[model samples]
Target: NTVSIPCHHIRLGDILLLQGRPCQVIRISTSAATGQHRYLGVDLFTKELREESSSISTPSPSVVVQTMCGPVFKQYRVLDMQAGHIVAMTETGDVKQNLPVSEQSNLYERLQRAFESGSVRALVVSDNGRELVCDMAV
Candidate 1:
């Protein structure tokens, strides 16, 4: 459930996952080692950003979710963010799930808190087969 694009292909405003948390690309630049690396901004549900070189960049895969019209899963923006969970929907049905918060970091937890505080809107690519409920996507 991922796409492999050259690091150079990443662009600003693209939605991608960083350590499993949905993130937006705020900036992209070239480097000697990492090729084209990016600076990711948090989802609107959790408005935050910082310049750091250690964070890894993971590409979002090409996937789709089932909807009334047909198979539709790519670029389905998050409609809501709840503590430890995300709420989204397709034409076929509603969607809700844990944020996959990891123990090593409370980033996802913080995302929930941010959402609770009304600071941002959750931005996610909801085409992951595992996250979707539609039979067509599966």
Candidate 2:
């Protein structure tokens, strides 16, 4: 089976699974080989070109909406959350952190709900290693 995606919605640096390998969109260009536009994807683990296709279809279960900082590409599941502490799995391993929450704001509450639901959209890690949870659509 095949799926079609609109080109206008695709963006650079989008993460995708190609042939079951986690790949990143490094660049896009018109392919003289196929006479069509192709997305040059490099396997995250192997760092080799895995595919060159005009359109890519990310399975619905793995699809993630990008956040303000960037896209969340790994560790989809949330392990637990309590008292503002969130536990989740990452590409490397499990990670837990205590994020500031306040009764004056709904930020913590929103996170708690998403954590409980277990439908984490994406997990973004800052350059310094701080993790941020984006539970809403981009």
Candidate 3:
């Protein structure tokens, strides 16, 4: 339903459309100018802070907003860390390579540990017909 909700009702762990793209809400910070200082939001994807606008409220007396039921997360298992990339196997028995560990040596180390732990996994986030490995789980 990607239901409508005022920015006043937003909470952590909910997804909302930012501008035109859907982003997961990570944080909300409040401020005061008494009558018109609106809420601030950080988009999970870019970690950028900005004022709210997804069919929502504004400082200039703009329209309302909505919480979107967005991007799906599917589990993918780690197959290897070949060439600095995380090789993964999806649920459908297909293999794909993504999540490049380039320059993130510590992250590489962590993944290596997870690999040996044999519980290595990732959350493949697919939205708008595009997918990427966004997180690791062990």
Highest TM-score against the true fold, candidate: 3
Q: Rank the candidates by lDDT, best first.
A: 3, 2, 1
Candidate 3 — which residues are off by over 4 angstroms? 1-26, 29-66, 99-108
The stretch of ten residues in a row with the least summed lDDT in candidate 1 is 64-73
Over 4 Å off in model 2, which ranges? Answer: 1-4, 55-77, 80-138
Q: For every model in order, what is the number of clashing pairs?
A: 10, 0, 5
Better of 1 and 2 by lDDT: 2
The digit string of per-residue lDDT tens for model 3 on 1-138 reads 134555566676455555534455666554443333233444444556645533323445564333333445567888877666788888897887665442322556677777876587866655355455555677
lDDT per residue (tens digit) for residues 1-138 in model 1? 454344444566554554443445577554578543544555432445633232344445553221111122242224465554556444355554443332223545555555455334333344333442111110
Q: TM-score of every model? A: 0.36, 0.37, 0.53
The C-alpha RMSD in Å for every predicted model, in order, reads 12.6, 11.8, 6.8
Name the better of 2 and 3 by lDDT. 3
**Per-candidate local distance difference test:** 0.41, 0.49, 0.56
- Please give the lDDT score for candidate 2: 0.49
